[PDB]
Design an enzyme around this catalytic site. Sequence first.
Site, mmCIF file in Angstrom:
data_model
loop_
_atom_site.group_PDB
_atom_site.id
_atom_site.type_symbol
_atom_site.label_atom_id
_atom_site.label_comp_id
_atom_site.label_asym_id
_atom_site.label_seq_id
_atom_site.Cartn_x
_atom_site.Cartn_y
_atom_site.Cartn_z
ATOM 1 N N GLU A 176 0.908 -1.217 0.000
ATOM 2 C CA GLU A 176 0.000 0.000 0.000
ATOM 3 C C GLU A 176 0.910 1.219 0.000
ATOM 4 O OE1 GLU A 176 -2.344 0.802 3.726
ATOM 5 O OE2 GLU A 176 -0.537 0.287 4.890
ATOM 6 N N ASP A 221 -9.229 1.015 7.729
ATOM 7 C CA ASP A 221 -9.401 0.779 6.271
ATOM 8 C C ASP A 221 -10.525 1.664 5.724
ATOM 9 O OD1 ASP A 221 -7.571 -1.362 6.669
ATOM 10 O OD2 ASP A 221 -8.599 -2.583 5.155
#
EC number: 3.2.1.156
Length: 377
Positions: free
Chosen positions: A65, A260
């Site tokens: 990420e 998230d």
Amino acid sequence: KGAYDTGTYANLFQRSGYREDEIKARLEQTWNDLFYGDEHTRIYYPVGDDKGYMLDTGNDDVRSEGMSYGMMMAVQMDKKHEFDRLWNYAYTYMQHTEGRYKDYFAWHCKPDGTRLSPGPAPDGEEFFAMALFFASNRWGDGPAPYDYQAQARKILHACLHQGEQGEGDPMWEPSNRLIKFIPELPFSDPSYHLPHFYELFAQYANEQDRTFWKEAAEASRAYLRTACHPVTGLSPEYANYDGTPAPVQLHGDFRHFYSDAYRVAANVALDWEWFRKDPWQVQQSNRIQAFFSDIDVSDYRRYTIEGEPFNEPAASPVGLLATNAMASLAADGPDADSFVKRFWNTPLRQGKRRYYDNCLYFFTMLALSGNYRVYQQ
């Protein structure tokens, strides 16, 4: 018409009253602190002559990420030397050359490049591909591995065709055109849905996959309408294909609004700015801002998606504020200007847990200054 059509990107800081000179300086200062700041602030670290990594300070590892985030920050800021160092690190240490994850990236490794587990994090691959298409369009393709367009197409080829390539699995479920949490599991993560990126994959990916990417954009906009709570605007970290919270997993309970899920509001608002296709996105942005309008950032908690606070605090409250403020790209309610000003007055996070907050912060600083753009050709 969206910014993709008009070429005009809203400068929300300027609309709020901040001067163009101060806004530019603040964006350049945010870049300098994150990439070249002091030992308690920076998240980017150069490695020898030609590499560099984005450090997850909290977990003492390097995540796909984070690497993909760094490349998107770099290309949007026209920082090719830092882009190429991050890309070379991901390419050299993280990308698989064979096996069931061929052309995917190991989701994390030690800072020295030792892989910790081979499985990918699909949100990494989609940011790598979008950032590399923008690198190709801004700067042009060099020799491998800096043949940006071909590298992006190779990643997205594997994302859709991994099951044909060998024993592994694609990152999208073919039957519903939705991104999966991981290739093997039959559920999703609403924060991974980037309809605005899939619109551009429909222009830049291998010709054979362009119809799929265009259907994926429409499927993801519809999916987010099912996943976001119709009262609060909150979404679960993991969700079933029908939008309901996925069951409790072996590694934790992801049914609630936590780290998230913060990116959903940011993702919805940028799709609205770039493409301006789904007016629900305005109301979803108004809802999440209304939910948080009277909550102090220092008091942000984990929440059930129907808005019940846990005693547990948010791990990344500055990250949550950043995504709530990025929602001002779409929100037209009474809280939009307040979040823009609250974000302006919030500094970068410092210390051990700064990584996730500071990534979300930088993307909001780009978007609210009118600098999170589509790079065409």
